Every structure is written in structure tokens, then in C-alpha cells.
Amino acid sequence: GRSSVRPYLEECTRRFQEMFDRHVVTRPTKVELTDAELREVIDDCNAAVAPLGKTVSDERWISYVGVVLWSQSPRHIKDMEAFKAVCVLNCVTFVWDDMDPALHDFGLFLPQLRKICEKYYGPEDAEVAYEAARAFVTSDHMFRDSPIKAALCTTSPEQYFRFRVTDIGVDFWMKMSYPIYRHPEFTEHAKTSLAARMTTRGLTIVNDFYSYDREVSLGQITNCFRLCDVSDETAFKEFFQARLDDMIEDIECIKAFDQLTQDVFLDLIYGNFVFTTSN
Amino acid sequence: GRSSVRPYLEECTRRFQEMFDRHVVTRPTKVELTDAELREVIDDCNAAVAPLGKTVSDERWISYVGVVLWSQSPRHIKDMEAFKAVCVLNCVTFVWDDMDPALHDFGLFLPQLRKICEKYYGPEDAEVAYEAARAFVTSDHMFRDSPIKAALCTTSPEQYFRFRVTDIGVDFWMKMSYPIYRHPEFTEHAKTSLAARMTTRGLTIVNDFYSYDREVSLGQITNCFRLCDVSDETAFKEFFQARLDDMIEDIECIKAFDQLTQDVFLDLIYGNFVFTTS
Ligand SMILES: [Mg+2]
Ligand SMILES: [Mg+2]
Ligand SMILES: [Mg+2]
Ligand SMILES: [Mg+2]
Numbered sequence A: 001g002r003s004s005v006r007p008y009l010e011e012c013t014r015r016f017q018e019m020f021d022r023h024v025v026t027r028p029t030k031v032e033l034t035d036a037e038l039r040e041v042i043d044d045c046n047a048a049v050a051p052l053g054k055t056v057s058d059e060r061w062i063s064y065v066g067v068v069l070w071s072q073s074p075r076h077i078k079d080m081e082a083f084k085a086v087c088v089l090n091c092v093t094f095v096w097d098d099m100d101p102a103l104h105d106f107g108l109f110l111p112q113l114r115k116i117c118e119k120y121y122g123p124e125d126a127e128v129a130y131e132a133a134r135a136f137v138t139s140d141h142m143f144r145d146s147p148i149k150a151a152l153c154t155t156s157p158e159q160y161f162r163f164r165v166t167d168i169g170v171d172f173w174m175k176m177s178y179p180i181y182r183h184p185e186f187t188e189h190a191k192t193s194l195a196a197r198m199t200t201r202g203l204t205i206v207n208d209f210y211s212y213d214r215e216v217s218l219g220q221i222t223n224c225f226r227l228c229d230v231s232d233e234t235a236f237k238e239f240f241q242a243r244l245d246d247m248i249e250d251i252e253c254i255k256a257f258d259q260l261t262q263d264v265f266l267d268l269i270y271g272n273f274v275f276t277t278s279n
Numbered sequence B: 001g002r003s004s005v006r007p008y009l010e011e012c013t014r015r016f017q018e019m020f021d022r023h024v025v026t027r028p029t030k031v032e033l034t035d036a037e038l039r040e041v042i043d044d045c046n047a048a049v050a051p052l053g054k055t056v057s058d059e060r061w062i063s064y065v066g067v068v069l070w071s072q073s074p075r076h077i078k079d080m081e082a083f084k085a086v087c088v089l090n091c092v093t094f095v096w097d098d099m100d101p102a103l104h105d106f107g108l109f110l111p112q113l114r115k116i117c118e119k120y121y122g123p124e125d126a127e128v129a130y131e132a133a134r135a136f137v138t139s140d141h142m143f144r145d146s147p148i149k150a151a152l153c154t155t156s157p158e159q160y161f162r163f164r165v166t167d168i169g170v171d172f173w174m175k176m177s178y179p180i181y182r183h184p185e186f187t188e189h190a191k192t193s194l195a196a197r198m199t200t201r202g203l204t205i206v207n208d209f210y211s212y213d214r215e216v217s218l219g220q221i222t223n224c225f226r227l228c229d230v231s232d233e234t235a236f237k238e239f240f241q242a243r244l245d246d247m248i249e250d251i252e253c254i255k256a257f258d259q260l261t262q263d264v265f266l267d268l269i270y271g272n273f274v275f276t277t278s
Helices: A006-023 A035-052 A058-071 A080-097 A106-120 A123-143 A147-155 A157-167 A170-181 A184-192 A194-217 A233-254 A259-276 B006-023 B035-052 B058-071 B080-097 B106-120 B123-143 B147-155 B157-167 B170-181 B184-191 B194-217 B233-254 B259-276
Strands: none
Touching (some): A035 A058, A035 A080, A035 A106, A058 A259, A157 A170, A157 B233, A170 A194, A184 B123, A194 A233, A233 B147, B035 B058, B035 B106, B058 B080, B080 B106, B157 B170, B157 B194, B184 B194, B184 B259, B233 B259
């Protein structure tokens, strides 16, 4: 009953798209990697997870990298080495998040993350990106089975989204993506985490809706829709409307930011939705 | 702008204390600096702000440093070099927030912050502390008269507190304070800024109430109580109770953290109340 949002899948997808068309208007665009770039990305991905003895096929990597291809802001890219680092860091932390946690060898993995950062970023940016990656995968480790997670995720939407600012990876995302754009204001918003805080709900609500069935079947509690009775059409749709209102207020405030910054923020939110709803 | 929360000053003070007595219980305790340590701190503060030309008296310094003496967690302190750094970094960024922006010389001030961090912290912590200080003062600068400040501060409690995570300085505070304690869990929560997100509303709500009259008289908008009509006793009491409920919910979640970490969070919120009402 509460095991599935399947009855709402089409309507909610329509409503998400309708909101974006009214409030963001500009559609997201795909980044094309040359086959050299893509093999380079994938090679780095393989080298970084090999110490954990894990093999991962090219097409699995390409499914992982799709979110980065779709959710950056191609208008504004200025550094494609930073872009590739984000492709790599995203994919390997994807692979890390999808392993038995008693296969997690930090001594083996963290230095691979540092090597990626040092390859693609300047000296200062390498440290910023690496600390963000370190802090993300460290958060993930220390909150498995944590009473803190249960408290933040079951108490209120406000407590849950506060947890997700880090846990969904959007602070990590912002802190390794600002070198792509070299835009002073965006760099500051990324480093204060305001960038992450402005985009967390737009990203998390979409992510949660389309992974609800999988996550609750796996016993996972990091999902906002577990806060309403999904089996109750009236309660579900009041909750979903509240989440839509959350996304709209965020997007309306995001438009107070400078133009380039707001472009990146909205391409992220809307691009993630497009990527999420594709094959 | 000609508004005031004076008619509620007593009752809100009593309501605040009562909430803390029921939900935190543990009293905050003042850190007493020896005479040598207070001198070392004032000397460092005076050095840091000497390049900006203007003078700060001992008594102002000591009024600034009191929030640090009261709002840390004394039973858990392990590193007093780190503690002194927070005294100095708090005081001088206070003085900087208190200056006409027309005199905000970053090229003079940022090396002084870096100097403080390099004297008191290990090399890794010194970069964390410095970067949070840099990000804090840079945020203050780019949001003065910025349309983003006006949109975040006037739209809803949620957008306003989202802005204050950085703007009230608690993220900076966490990221320079964790070396005081060398507690692994607290260090991570500081570095993910979860520590700052848990404590922002309890700090900001207290700070906003007791600075409201001052701030509205100066045309400042960074105060959540501008979001209700404080001249409407009925509206103010509903808004004030909403913010108490926010503090209570946060405090109750804070107690799900490990025992040392939660002591630090709650001593910070409760000690800030004590210092503000002192
Ligand atoms: Mg995860
Ligand atoms: Mg998910
Ligand atoms: Mg201020
Ligand atoms: Mg104030």
C-alpha cells in the first residue's frame, strides 16, 4: 500500500514538467564528450575503483555519468578539465555508494579521490574538491544505521532536507563544479554552501519521488515521501503539492541571483529531472 | 522602522529561559581566561586590526569576546590554543562587521586572519579556519545591498534561516571551533556544516529578538522578526511561538547526536542566550 508511488507516476511526472515549463522555461542541454574525453573519463574511473577489486563495465559508467552530462550548464562551461573531474568524481562516488559498506576501504579509496582532484584541478581547487568528496563519503559511512539519520529523516521535511544538503551530495557537487565556470559569485555561493542549500529541495524531491519504490523495498529511510501516507491518495497529493510549493519558492528565490549563477542552479535542478525521467 | 519589541522584552526573556530549562537543563559555564591569556588575545586582536588604522579599546574587545567565553563547552575543551584563536577570530570579525564598509580593505585584513590561524592551529585546521573566515567576510561584503539578501530575508522563515547559516556566522564558528575539542564526530559535523545547520535557528532567533530595535532603526533587514507585524500583539505572539517551536524541534533532534557533540551544540545555543541577555 505504502510500498509504491506507481499510481502517481504519470501525473507527478506531468506536474513536475508543467512546473518547470512555467517557472524555469529554459530547457537543459546535453554536454557532448568526444570519444577521447569519454574513454579518458572511464579510464580514470576504472583506475580509481580497481584497488577495491571492483570491475565496472563501460555502459554502467555511462549510465552513471549521464547526470553530469545533463545537469551542468553548457552555456557557461569554461574549463573542461574541471568538467571531466566532475564526471569522474560523480561516477566513482556512485560506485562507492553502491557497494556493500564492508567493502569500503577508505585507505584504498581516498587517495584515488585525491589523485583525480590533483590531476584536473589547480592546487587550491584540488583541495576544495577533495575535502568535499572526503566529507561526503565520510558522511555516508558514519550515518549508516545512525540514530541521527532516523531523527532527521522522520521528524519533519525541514529536518530531512537539512540532512540531505550533504547526504544527497549537492554540496559536494557544488564544491567540485565551480571550477568549470570560473565565475566569482558562483564560486563564493558554492564555498559558503548557499549554492547547495538553494538547490537541495529541487534535487531531493525529484530524486526521492523516482527512487521511492526501490528505496523503501530496500528498507532505506532517506526519502521525503516516507513522511506521508503514500497509500492515501488525498494525503499523498497534499504532500506532493507542498513539495511542489517548496520547489517553486526555491526557484523564485534563485532568480534573485546573478544571471550566470541562476542559470547554473536551474539547469542543475531541471537537468536532473530530465536525466532522472529518461532511460 | 519605528517598531519595537520592547512590550515583549520581559515575557520573551522569561519564555526563552523556561524553554531552555525544560529542554536543555544543563547550564552553560563561563570560560575564565588567565590574565596572560586575555592579554595575548587582546594583543593579537589589536595587531590584526592595526592595518585598518582605527583603534579598539580593551573594554570593547572584552565585550566582544564574552560570547566565546560563555558559548563554548568547557567540560570538553582539549586545546586552548584553538580556544584563543576563536576568541581572536570572533573579536576581530566583530570589529570588521562593525565598520563602515567603505574602509573594508581586504588586502590588509585577510593576511591578518591568515596570521591568526597559522599561529594557533595545526596546518590542516589552519586552512579550514582561515577558509571559513574568508568565506564569512566575503559573504558579508557581497550581500550588503544585494537583491539576494532582500529575497532570502523577506520571503519566508525558511529562506531567511537558509541565508543565516552563513550570514550569522555559525558555520564559520563551527569550522574554527572543532579543534578546541578534537572530537572526531564533531569535527565531521562541523566540516559538512550539519553542525551549523542544527544550531542556526536557536542562535539566530535569540540574536534577532534582542537586536531587533537596533537593527530596524538602522534600516537593516537581516532579522526574522521583520517577517511578522510586531505591533500586532496577536500576530507577534503567534510568530514568536512558531520560532520557539523551531528551537524546540532542533534541540530535540540535536539530542540524537553523540553526547559530546550535543553538549557542544546546546551549550552554544544556551550560552549564546545567556551572553546576549547579560
Ligand atoms: Mg546515499
Ligand atoms: Mg534516492
Ligand atoms: Mg551581520
Ligand atoms: Mg542581529
